[PDB]
């Protein structure tokens, strides 16, 4: 293998949980919508859902008031809105 690639770049014992640190510093990421192109061609405050029709909508319904709730919205709905 050519020496110049190795020169400045270059069973394993390393661990994937090492990524937590990076995960701690990293903004929300998408798998197949490149971030920089989104920056160039799209607005700075766009909402984004990757592969929205992959599976049916994930949610649950309150037994008491019958509201359909997004998974991230259920808890406070249960605290002071029902």
Residues that bind Zn ion (CB under 5 A): 62, 64-65, 82
Using CB under 8 A as the binding rule, the residues of this chain from 33 to 72 that contact other proteins are 33-34, 37-38, 40-43, 45-49, 51-72
- Residue 59 beta carbon to Zn ion: minimum distance, rounded to whole angstroms: 13
List of residues 6+ apart from 48 with CB closer than 8 A:
30, 33, 38
Q: Annotated binding residue at 79? A: no
Kindly state the tokens that stand for 43.
Answer: 């607005």
Task: Tell whether residue 3 is a contact of other proteins (CB under 8 A).
Answer: no
Partner from Zn ion, other proteins, none contacting 8, C-beta within 5 to 8 A by type = none
Task: Name the residue with tokens 């990293």.
Answer: 26
Kindly state the tokens that stand for 1.
Answer: 């293998």
Kindly state the tokens that stand for 30.
Answer: 């998408």
Which residue numbers belong to the known binding site?
Answer: 62, 65, 77, 82
């Amino acid at each position: 293998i050519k020496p110049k690639v190795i020169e400045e770049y270059s069973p394993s014992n390393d661990s994937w949980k090492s990524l937590m640190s990076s995960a701690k510093d990293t903004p929300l990421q998408y798998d197949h919508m490149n971030r920089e192109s989104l920056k160039k061609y799209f607005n700075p405050n766009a909402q984004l859902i990757e592969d929205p029709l992959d599976k049916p909508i994930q949610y649950r319904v309150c037994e008491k008031c019958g509201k359909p709730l997004a998974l991230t919205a259920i808890v406070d709905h249960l605290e002071n809105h029902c």
